Amino acid sequence: QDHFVLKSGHAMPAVGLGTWRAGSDTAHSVRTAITEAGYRHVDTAAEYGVEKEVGKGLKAAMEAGIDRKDLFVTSKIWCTNLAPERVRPALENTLKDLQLDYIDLYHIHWPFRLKDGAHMPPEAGEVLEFDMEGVWKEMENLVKDGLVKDIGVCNYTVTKLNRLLRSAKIPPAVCQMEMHPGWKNDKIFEACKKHGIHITAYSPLGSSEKNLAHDPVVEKVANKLNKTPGQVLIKWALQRGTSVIPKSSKDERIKENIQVFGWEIPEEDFKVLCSIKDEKRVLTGEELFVNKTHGPYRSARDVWDHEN
């Protein structure tokens, strides 16, 4: 399927353009992706520092004839704004930068609150308690006021998900998580499926740090299908039933990355990719939330509630 239907009934395109670390060509990339390559989904975040440029690209694409109703824009609220009174201001700032009246999906970027001016790695006292229930209530008010069509979360665990579901009046529409061969996170995927929550795979190519385009296992599959390794990695996500948001700042790759319809990865090869051991995680959150000397999180396991 080229799109997924969220619980709210809103459709979400299966493939989107990631914009993290997109650089100076951000605006150009977004316009090219949408017009030339047919993308109808863009994923960004306030913390990426590129939303003003993404807004310029979206504006140019709309000026080119694409209607706002046909575009799906996702953004995320950063840790420093995860306090009830800070939710609305953070979202309004994001709409201003993006030049939009509303966004289609707004995610909790990480389920941890950071003090203003927090450093990487965090100092003592800088990682604060996340009032999940109170913050989520203000996220729901964004939907009530038509500023956001759907709300979701990123980087969750099953324990955090169950806590959210006991409180939420509007359940998260989407759970966005790092997923690729070598880091399937089947555990969170199964909890989301159990509750009818759609899942979006981020860093589908293993990001740049653990990029899989040159992995021999992926190359072997790609050569037999006459597809590029990136296309095989993106198609693997769609075959698992998740949306997927590959990032490239290169027009050629932006086009390459969406040529993933009209063919499939044979089951035997899909299984080989699934067999790659889960240990290749790119984003552990250690540089953002771990201070082993003072806590509150002393290791990556503490960040993930000892679930992986």
Ligand X SMILES: NC(=O)C1=CN([C@@H]2O[C@H](COP(=O)(O)OP(=O)(O)OC[C@H]3O[C@@H](n4cnc5c(N)ncnc54)[C@H](OP(=O)(O)O)[C@@H]3O)[C@@H](O)[C@H]2O)C=CC1
Annotated binding site for substrate: 109
Contact 116, 293 (CB under 8 A): no
Residue 78 CB, shortest distance to ligand X, in Å, is 11
Amino acid sitting at position 165: L
CB nearer to ligand X: pick between 206 and 293:
206
Check if 48 is active-site.
yes
Place of tokens 């996702």: 74
CB nearer to ligand X: pick between 203 and 291:
203
Amino acid sitting at position 255: K
Question: Known binding site: residues?
Answer: 109
The candidate with the shortest Cα–Cα distance to 139, out of 88, 99, 80, is 88
Residues that bind ligand X (CB under 6 A): 18-20, 43, 109, 154-155, 176, 202-208, 211, 213, 228, 230, 245-250, 253, 256-257, 283
Contacts of 279 (CB under 8 A, 6+ apart): 182, 183
CB nearer to ligand X: pick between 94 and 207:
207
CB nearer to ligand X: pick between 144 and 242:
242
Torsion of CA 98, 104, 108, 114, to 10 degrees: 20
Residue 245 CB, shortest distance to ligand X, in Å, is 5
CB nearer to ligand X: pick between 257 and 291:
257
Residues designated catalytic: 48
